[PDB]
């Protein structure tokens, strides 16, 4: 099924041609164009009052990366390196070393925000829900080096946004 978008021949009756000449001389579709914009000025604007008003999001939103931890206090990360092995941009660097207690934890877990693509592949690959993409997105920095995240900075993000991230995962883990 196809339709001819522009295959309309105009009628050549005296009334039709008089109307076409009137539209040409007395600009008619031009007045319609004016009227449409008049109708929308009288309409309500769509602008929101940022930063006092924020655009809507979803619990699945991908933002600032963060390392979570168990309710006991121990970090969830076990240095299985799935996130490092699955990152499309190779933005994660992990070095592991058996801790004094014996549990295997990262001696270095750096995520480079200037190289990250915010795909969320790491948070899917993680088998313990250790690394997540937090809800934060207003974390712009004045210098480049501040975007090269360390293990300590990611742990601070996890401890800061934990209230939001726990609820976000709680409202989405069933879909996964």
């Amino acid at each position: 099924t196809y339709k001819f978008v522009n295959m309309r021949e105009p009628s050549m009756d005296m009334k039709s041609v008089t109307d076409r000449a009137a539209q040409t001389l007395l600009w008619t579709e031009l007045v319609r164009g004016l009227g449409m914009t008049l109708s929308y000025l009288f309409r309500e604007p769509a602008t929101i009052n940022y930063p006092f008003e924020k655009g809507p999001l979803s619990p699945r939103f991908r933002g600032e990366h963060a390392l979570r931890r168990y309710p006991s206090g121990e970090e969830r990360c076990i240095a299985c390196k799935l996130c490092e092995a699955v990152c499309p941009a190779q933005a994660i660097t992990i070095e592991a070393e058996p801790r004094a207690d014996g549990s295997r934890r990262t001696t270095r877990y750096d995520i480079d925000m200037t190289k990250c693509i915010y795909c969320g592949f790491c948070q899917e690959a993680c088998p313990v829900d250790a690394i997540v993409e937090g809800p934060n997105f207003e974390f712009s920095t004045e210098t480049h080096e501040e975007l090269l995240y360390n293990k300590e900075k990611l742990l601070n993000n996890g401890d800061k946004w934990e209230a939001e991230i726990a609820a976000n995962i709680q409202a989405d883990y069933l879909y996964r």
Binding site: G35, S39, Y40, F42, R43, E44, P56, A171, L174, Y175
Partner: protein, 55 residues
């Protein structure tokens, strides 16, 4: 972020259509941002027998 009746007639006449019926601003018809938990189904291979991967 509702227009008076006098204004609505001006908007409608300037456009030639009932704008109040179909607006581009979502007021309350949207789905509630908090939703009940879902129960996702299983695929056609979640069987406990006759489920050999060779087939």
């Amino acid at each position: 972020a509702s227009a008076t009746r006098v204004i609505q007639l001006l908007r409608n006449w300037a456009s030639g259509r009932d704008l109040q019926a179909k607006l581009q601003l979502r007021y309350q018809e949207i789905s509630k941002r908090t939703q009940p938990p879902p129960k996702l189904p299983v695929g056609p291979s979640h069987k406990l027998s006759n489920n050999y991967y060779c087939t």
